[PDB]
C-alpha cells in the first residue's frame, strides 16, 4: 500500500474541478477517492470509453480505476 | 614515510616488463553470451577479462594499458 508518510494520492486538478463544481470526464484512473468527491458523477476513461461513476460514501478510499473495467 | 606504487593492467607480461615486487591476486571476470543472434540458446562461449595488479614500495623516498596509483 501507499506509505502513510506520503498520505493519499489525490489528483490536484481533478480535486480542484470537483471543489469548483454535470459529469466530469477524467483519465485519472489511479486517483484515490476523497470524501469531497461524494455526490458527484465522474466519467473515468477505460481505454476506449468513459464509464460514469456516481460517488457514494462506501467507495471512499478506493482508486477511481477500480470502478471502470478495461477488459 | 614511504611511497607505495600500485600498477594494474590487463597483461601480465606488460606489467612485469613495466615494473623494471609483491604480486597481488588477479581479478578475473567471465562473460557468458549466446553464440547465436536469435533464439538458439544452450550454445554459449566464455570471454575472460583479467586485471593484474602489482605493488612496490620505496621507503623514505610505461606502455599504454597500465594505470599506476602512487600513495
Amino acid at each position: 500500500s501507499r506509505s502513510l508518510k506520503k498520505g493519499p494520492y489525490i489528483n490536484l486538478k481533478l480535486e480542484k474541478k470537483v471543489l469548483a463544481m454535470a459529469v466530469i470526464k477524467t483519465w485519472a484512473r489511479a486517483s484515490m477517492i476523497s470524501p469531497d468527491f461524494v455526490g458527484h458523477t465522474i466519467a473515468v476513461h477505460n481505454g476506449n470509453k468513459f464509464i460514469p461513476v456516481f460517488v457514494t460514501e462506501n467507495m471512499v478510499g478506493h482508486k477511481l480505476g477500480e470502478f471502470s473495467p478495461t477488459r | 614515510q614511504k611511497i607505495r606504487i600500485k600498477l594494474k593492467s590487463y597483461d601480465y607480461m606488460l606489467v612485469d616488463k613495466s615494473a623494471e615486487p609483491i604480486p597481488l591476486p588477479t581479478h578475473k571476470r567471465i562473460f557468458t553470451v549466446n553464440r547465436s543472434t536469435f533464439v538458439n540458446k544452450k550454445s554459449r562461449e566464455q570471454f575472460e577479462l583479467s586485471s593484474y595488479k602489482r605493488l612496490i614500495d620505496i621507503y623514505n623516498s610505461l606502455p599504454s594499458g597500465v594505470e599506476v596509483e602512487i600513495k
Partner: protein
C-alpha cells in the same frame, strides 16, 4: 469449553489454542505469554484460575468466532456490493 469450542484435551496448549477460528500458532503463543501459562503442559492440566485467565485474555481484545465470521461475511458482502 473455553469459548463455545471443546478443545482436544490431550494436545499441548500452544497447539490446542489454534483450534479456535480466530487464533493461529503465533496468536496462541502470544496469548499464553500474556496469560502467564506454560506452553508445555496439556489442556487437561489447567487449573480453573489458569483457564479463567486464558479466557479473559481471549475476550476483550480478540475476534475469535461468531463475531469474526460475521465481520468477514460483512466485508465479503461489502466487496460484492462494490
Amino acid at each position: 469449553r473455553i469459548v463455545g469450542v471443546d478443545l482436544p484435551q490431550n494436545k499441548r496448549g500452544f497447539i490446542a489454542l489454534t483450534y479456535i477460528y480466530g487464533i493461529g500458532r503465533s496468536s496462541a503463543i502470544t496469548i499464553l505469554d500474556k496469560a502467564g501459562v506454560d506452553r508445555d503442559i496439556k489442556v487437561k492440566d489447567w487449573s480453573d484460575d489458569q483457564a479463567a485467565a486464558i479466557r479473559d485474555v481471549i475476550g476483550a481484545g480478540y475476534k475469535v468466532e461468531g463475531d469474526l465470521r460475521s465481520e468477514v461475511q460483512l466485508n465479503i458482502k461489502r466487496l460484492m456490493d462494490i
